[PDB]
């Protein structure tokens, strides 16, 4: 697993790149996959820069923090822009949770340095909403 | 809901105080409540500084980020300190997730300020592992 600030931030950046693609370039694919009639689905981004919409981890507690569950359920009950914003915020929160899981053993200064790296990338919420 | 940097840190510090108590002073009761015989359980910390072990939220998708699911399923196969450390890191991650959920509308410099305040308190993992 990632342990150094550099390793963790590389992992963060790769997962983020995947989720950014899901919510922008591939947004029509992502949206279509989130059918409200299916079982609870989550949006995952992986360090190989792939994104997927899938069921949550079958075995619990999961090795990593898990994304928001059941994002598909609300898809057809709100305007698209509002649903994508909801997905984006939960995705930003998940990326942070994953990095600081890997970063549990970093000291206070290292954790601040890692957040600083993360904070130099616009949030998915910023991107999807087109924030000024 | 908390919106300013200060409001979000107040909420964070109260939930953290609750979780820290569960993992230390109240650990005998907390450990007991994480019954492997039950369905999947979670550890919640609330802004009134109460901690609670309960099933996950039924409202799906939930409003707030959700804590780690099924910590009771890991309790008996680990040494107590290792299990508490696992709960501690997932709980630290949940606290961060909750704060930056409330903080989604903060800008880059506001989020930096918020993290600086959060980063002024030892993490739950810091305390549980003796760092």
């Amino acid at each position: 697993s990632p342990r150094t600030v550099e390793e963790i931030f590389k992992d963060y950046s790769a997962r983020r790149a995947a989720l950014l693609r899901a919510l922008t370039k591939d947004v029509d694919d992502f949206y279509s996959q989130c059918d409200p009639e299916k079982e609870n689905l989550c949006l995952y981004g992986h360090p190989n820069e792939s994104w997927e919409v899938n069921l949550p981890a079958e075995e619990v507690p999961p090795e990593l923090p898990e994304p928001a569950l059941g994002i598909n359920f609300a898809r057809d009950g709100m305007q698209r822009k509002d649903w994508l914003s909801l997905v984006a915020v939960h995705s930003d929160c998940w990326l942070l949770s994953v990095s600081f899981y890997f970063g549990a053993r970093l000291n206070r200064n290292e954790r601040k340095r890692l957040f600083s790296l993360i904070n130099d990338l616009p949030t998915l919420f910023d991107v999807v909403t087109g924030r000024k | 809901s908390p919106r300013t940097v200060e409001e979000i840190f107040k909420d964070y510090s109260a939930r953290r105080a609750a979780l820290l108590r569960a993992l230390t002073k109240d650990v005998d009761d907390f450990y007991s409540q994480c019954d492997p015989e039950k369905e999947n359980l979670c550890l919640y910390g609330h802004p009134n500084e109460s901690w609670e072990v309960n099933l996950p939220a039924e409202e799906v998708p939930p409003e707030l980020p959700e804590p780690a699911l099924g910590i009771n399923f890991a309790r008996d196969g680990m040494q107590r300190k290792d299990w508490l450390s696992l709960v501690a890191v997932h709980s630290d991650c949940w606290l961060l997730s909750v704060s930056f959920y409330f903080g989604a509308r903060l800008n880059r410099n506001e989020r930096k300020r918020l993290f600086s305040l959060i980063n002024d308190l030892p993490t739950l993992f810091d305390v549980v592992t003796g760092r």
Binding site: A57, V60 | N40, G70, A74
Partner: peptide, 8 residues
């Protein structure tokens, strides 16, 4: 075991 299938 330290994991089980998630509850239904």
């Amino acid at each position: 075991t330290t994991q089980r299938k998630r509850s239904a």
